[PDB]
Amino acid sequence: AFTVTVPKDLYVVEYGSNMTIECKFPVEKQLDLAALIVYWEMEDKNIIQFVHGEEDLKTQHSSYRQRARLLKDQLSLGNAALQITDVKLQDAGVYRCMISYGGADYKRITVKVNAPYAAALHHHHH
Amino acid sequence: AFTVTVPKDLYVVEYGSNMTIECKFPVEKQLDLAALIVYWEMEDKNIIQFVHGEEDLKTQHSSYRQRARLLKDQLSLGNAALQITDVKLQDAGVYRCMISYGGADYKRITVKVNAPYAAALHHHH
Numbered sequence: 685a686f687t688v689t690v691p692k693d694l695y696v697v698e699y700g701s702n703m704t705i706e707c708k709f710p711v712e713k714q715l716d717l718a719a720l721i722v723y724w725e726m727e728d729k730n731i732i733q734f735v736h737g738e739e740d741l742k743t744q745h746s747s748y749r750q751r752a753r754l755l756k757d758q759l760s761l762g763n764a765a766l767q768i769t770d771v772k773l774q775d776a777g778v779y780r781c782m783i784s785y786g787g788a789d790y791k792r793i794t795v796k797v798n799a800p801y802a803a804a805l806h807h808h809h810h
Numbered sequence: 811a812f813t814v815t816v817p818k819d820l821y822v823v824e825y826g827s828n829m830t831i832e833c834k835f836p837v838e839k840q841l842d843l844a845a846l847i848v849y850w851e852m853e854d855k856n857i858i859q860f861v862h863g864e865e866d867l868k869t870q871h872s873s874y875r876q877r878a879r880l881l882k883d884q885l886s887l888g889n890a891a892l893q894i895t896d897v898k899l900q901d902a903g904v905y906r907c908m909i910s911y912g913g914a915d916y917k918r919i920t921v922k923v924n925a926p927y928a929a930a931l932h933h934h935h
């Protein structure tokens with residue numbers, strides 16, 4: 685049946701770098717945007733809603749506001765990759781890619797985030 | 811748009827009893843079963859799948875074998891209620907009710923489970 689697949693489920697990213705986590709689903713013929721739902725979340729924090737044609741951000745968590753860009757271009761190729769700019773220590777954890785396009789599945793992807801000493805020191809308080 | 815709503819988000823059940831946690835979604839007219847999906851899952855343990863008219867248990871987690879039953883009747887009124895039989899403390903935690911019906915949402919429900927001394931004594935060892 686319908687199945688979202690993840691090129692890798694573990695990404696290890698350095699502090700402050702960019703990060704594109706990929707998520708592929710099948711595109712029958714040409715992608716029907718009105719029938720598509722894409723939904724990126726990370727440990728109960730809603731990162732991105734893509735519902736029947738456009739992005740819902742009025743539900744986006746604060747900690748991700750204007751850092752999480754869903755590549756509206758690669759949706760037409762069945763790749764819902766999420767791009768996060770300037771990664772922080774807080775961004776490490778289990779991400780969930782949930783897709784509903786005549787069927788629905790999800791996959792988990794883990795991010796560990798490396799940081800130099802100074803970053804890990806400021807995260808130890810702030 | 812589409813909205814899954816949960817009558818309670820906290821259940822407190824005593825040990826060894828049964829428990830039905832409800833989950834409602836909108837029913838427009840007559841229900842389209844082939845397009846309906848019901849995932850009931852609990853902290854990365856899948857409890858119940860409902861795809862194209864039937865329950866899939868091909869991934870039902872060990873902890874739930876023939877104890878977790880989704881009431882197929884109440885689907886027709888948009889009621890995704892889940893029954894867990896003779897609950898153990900391993901069942902305390904946060905459940906996710908996920909529904910895909912021309913649109914999609916989910917909600918969380920937390921279960922705390924109270925138990926007498928001997929039962930806990932076991933979950934310890």
Ligand SMILES: CNCc1ccc(-c2cc(Cl)cc(Cl)c2)o1
Nearest residue numbers: 723782789790847908909910915
């Ligand atoms: C906040 N958007 C909720 C959302 C988007 C996609 C899903 C979903 C639903 C089901 Cl029934 C199954 C699977 Cl695998 C995923 O839920």
